[PDB]
Design a protein around this ligand. Structure first.
Ligand SMILES: O=C(O)c1ccc(-c2ccc3c(c2)nc(-c2cn[nH]c2-c2cccc(Cl)c2)n3CCCn2ccnc2)cc1
Ligand SMILES: O=C1N[C@@H](c2cccnc2)c2c1n[nH]c2-c1ccccc1
Length: 146
């Protein structure tokens, strides 16, 4: 995630196995009950899309749920692309490109690009946006198994 240190500066750190273990735990012990959603939110504070994918990977064992999640993400990504079509052109040095749906999902973007967008002036909070899509997916999964 991207967190603030004591020197007021936003710095990146990899997702902690402590956090990952807590996520794996909530799912493996409660299996997509409604509780998994608030837990996912609590554990994903400041997360990059990369962090979120790491979290989702650790529970890839639940294949049906994971496919539902991936498809929800695809749909949300498409809607993002419909509403926010990317400026497909030359960009001057000092500037950076705009993210498409698959960039927000961390599929076609690097960690450095993700950090770049999250800390740009002005920013695009790609982690928060992706988290939104994932939570929509989690809600679908919770309904499915309700
Ligand atoms: O749902 C949300 O929470 C949500 C939804 C959308 C956005 C969003 C989307 C596109 C945005 C944006 C913010 N800020 C800018 C924006 C405005 N100036 N520069 C940028 C910018 C350029 C490159 C990389 C980054 Cl990092 C930012 N753009 C690019 C401007 C593209 N543009 C300009 C005019 N018409 C379109 C942020 C949050
Ligand atoms: O790089 C990645 N993109 C997403 C992604 C999203 C959608 C379709 N296909 C890839 C992703 C990645 N890794 N795990 C996952 C993932 C996403 C969802 C569930 C489990 C794993």
């Amino acid at each position: 995630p991207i967190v603030q240190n004591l020197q007021g500066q936003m710095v990146h750190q990899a997702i902690s196995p402590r956090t990952l273990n807590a996520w794996v735990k909530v799912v493996e012990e409660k299996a997509f009950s409604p509780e998994v959603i608030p837990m996912f939110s609590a554990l994903s504070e400041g997360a990059t899309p990369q962090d979120l994918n790491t979290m989702l990977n650790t529970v890839g064992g639940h294949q049906a749920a994971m496919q539902m999640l991936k498809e929800t993400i695809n749909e949300e990504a498409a809607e993002w692309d419909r509403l926010h079509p990317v400026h497909a052109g030359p960009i001057a040095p000092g500037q950076m490109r705009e993210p498409r749906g698959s960039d927000i999902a961390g599929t076609t973007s690097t960690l450095q690009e993700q950090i770049g967008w999250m800390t740009h002036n002005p920013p695009i909070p790609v982690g928060e946006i992706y988290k939104r899509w994932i939570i929509l997916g989690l809600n679908k999964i919770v309904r499915m198994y309700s």
